[PDB]
């Protein structure tokens, strides 16, 4: 009863619209995400595509049982995720939380004290600024997450 990709290498689900998995903070907190993978994606509405598929594709290998799948959830810009959903729609257990990942309310919603890993990817256009200021957002997010407190 598990739908796999034609090659049999990856888990698969029928194509669904973005809102089929789009969630707000209330819905994200309602879902008891545990041992999942949070992806703090710093992207603009027109920032170049980075292919989040290549991040979720290895996460959905067929050698993992369906219950062994880590529920990946992406916290980032919503238009960029609209652009990425064309490729991201076929992976099960995926979820989307719009808004900036620097917002502490999001990280409270998608339980980040309980997540198995918190990727921090920046899709913004950089290296046109000072090289030391290129990763300002990623370092700020890392420090913000490391400075949080939970119960």
């Amino acid at each position: 009863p598990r739908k796999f990709d034609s090659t049999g290498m990856f888990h698969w689900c029928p194509d669904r619209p973005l809102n089929d998995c789009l969630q707000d903070r209330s819905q994200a907190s309602a879902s008891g995400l545990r041992n999942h993978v949070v992806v703090c994606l710093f992207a603009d509405a027109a920032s170049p595509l980075i292919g989040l598929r290549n991040l979720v594709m290895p996460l959905r290998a067929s050698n993992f049982h369906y219950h062994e799948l880590k529920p990946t959830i992406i916290v980032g810009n919503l238009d960029y995720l609209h652009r990425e959903w064309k490729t991201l729609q076929n992976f099960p257990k995926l979820s989307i939380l719009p808004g900036s990942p620097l917002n502490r309310a999001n990280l409270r919603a998608v339980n980040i004290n309980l997540c198995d890993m918190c990727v921090i990817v920046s899709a913004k256009d950089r290296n046109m600024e000072d090289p030391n200021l290129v990763d300002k957002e990623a370092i700020l997010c890392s420090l913000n997450i490391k400075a949080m407190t939970f119960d």
Partner: protein
């Protein structure tokens, strides 16, 4: 009452302050203060904040005094609350946290009328200060006084300039206003 409208223009470039008033007749090379607009509170330049980088170094407690005087208190816990991204939130708060509800605000009082009107009748500033502090817990910071005595002949305008903590024996015109650090309304 076109010219009686109280307005505070904020200036990005301080050198433009000369254009705020025409009767000032001040030299263009004058600094930001000593100019009639800034000295009257009508103008305000962002450049002042740059000078706040200096004092906050020389006086450690300058910035925390400024913020308490200015921002309504802005308790650090409040920007911790705003740091959670949920925005400003709260409901019918308990009286325990309402204990700080009655703190010291800054306001203006008029010597034209009220319990302090007698000090405007040729009284001295120190008398008003001591009386207000002893009777109402009111701390008179300074004066807001007409640029020229409002007799419609000396100056028919409602223009006022600020005097920060005038001396003990400063005479008090009846039309002068007083900046106060009033407590409990």
């Amino acid at each position: 009452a076109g010219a009686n409208v109280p307005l505070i223009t904020e200036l990005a470039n301080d050198s433009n302050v000369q254009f705020l008033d025409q009767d000032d007749d001040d030299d263009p090379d004058t600094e930001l203060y000593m100019t009639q607009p800034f000295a009257c509170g009508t103008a305000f330049a962002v450049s002042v904040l740059d000078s706040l980088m200096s004092t906050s170094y020389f006086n450690d407690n300058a910035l925390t005094l400024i913020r308490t005087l200015i921002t309504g208190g802005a308790t650090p816990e409040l920007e911790q609350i705003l740091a959670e991204g949920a925005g400003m939130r709260g409901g019918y708060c308990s009286p325990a946290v309402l204990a700080n509800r009655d703190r010291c605000r800054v306001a203006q009082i008029s010597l034209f009328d009220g319990p302090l009107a007698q000090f405007g009748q040729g009284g001295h500033y120190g008398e008003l200060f001591v009386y207000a502090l002893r009777h109402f817990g009111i701390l008179c910071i300074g004066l807001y006084r007409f640029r020229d005595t409002n007799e419609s002949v000396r100056s028919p305008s409602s223009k006022r300039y600020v005097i920060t903590n005038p001396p003990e024996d400063f005479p008090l015109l009846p039309t002068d206003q007083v900046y106060v650090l009033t407590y409990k309304q």
